[PDB]
Amino acid sequence: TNRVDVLDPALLRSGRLDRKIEFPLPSEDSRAQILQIHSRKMTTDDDINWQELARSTDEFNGAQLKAVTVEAGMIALRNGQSSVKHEDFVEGISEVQARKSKSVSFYA
Amino acid sequence: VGLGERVSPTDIEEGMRVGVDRSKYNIELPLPPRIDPSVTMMTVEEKPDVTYSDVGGCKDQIEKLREVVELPLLSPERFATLGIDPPKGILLYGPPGTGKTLCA
Amino acid sequence: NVMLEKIKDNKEKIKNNRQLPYLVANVVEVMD
């Protein structure tokens, strides 16, 4: 249950629900792994660079990363390549992002 | 209750309506499972002529339709090589009167 | 031999009652 600040003070006593374990975020170590395991299912090529991707992604959970890789396959299929390109993963990153994908200036 | 007149157990399906005795409570004759038959057959509509010419405009949602339905069917060899899952389930949603059925 | 036969008659009457259909119920509680 998502943060303990939300939870009520009387059932959050120490030794009641044993240990209380907090989950620290991906730190550009665990990211690279998390991606690696998701791509294992799809075809694996050396065109893809896992380490570069780890660097791009900042403040993304396990769930979000997973979405980045699923989005890549839809793109590769659309292009009609036999094999997914590194290029497609980058494009999935800015589609999973809340903001709209790279476009010409018009206000900024 | 127990087994029918002489009818196999396999024929006495779940949810299947059955006639039983007025006072000796036991299966006699199987009866049609509900009245899902015949009503449903009215509802079924078969491959209408509707084409994209008759769809006013084309959007991105239609381009995302095409991938899921068309591409694995014409060539499932592409989906294998990629090693992605082949899309075959879709959920369509939005405001009513958009034309969700027209594209299907 | 004599004792066993007396069990065999008692068992047949139990058999008649157990014969399907029978009311299904639930036991709210046993007082005992």
Ligand SMILES: Nc1ncnc2c1ncn2[C@@H]1O[C@H](COP(=O)(O)OP(=O)(O)NP(=O)(O)O)[C@@H](O)[C@H]1O
């Ligand atoms: N792109 C289109 N080309 C032509 N007529 C259209 C188009 N889109 C909408 N219409 C019309 O508007 C009607 C309402 O859309 P319709 O396909 O009936 O429903 P829907 O969006 O699937 N609704 P619902 O399932 O009830 O929430 C269509 O049947 C057509 O009359």
Ligand SMILES: [Mg+2]
């Ligand atoms: Mg509809």
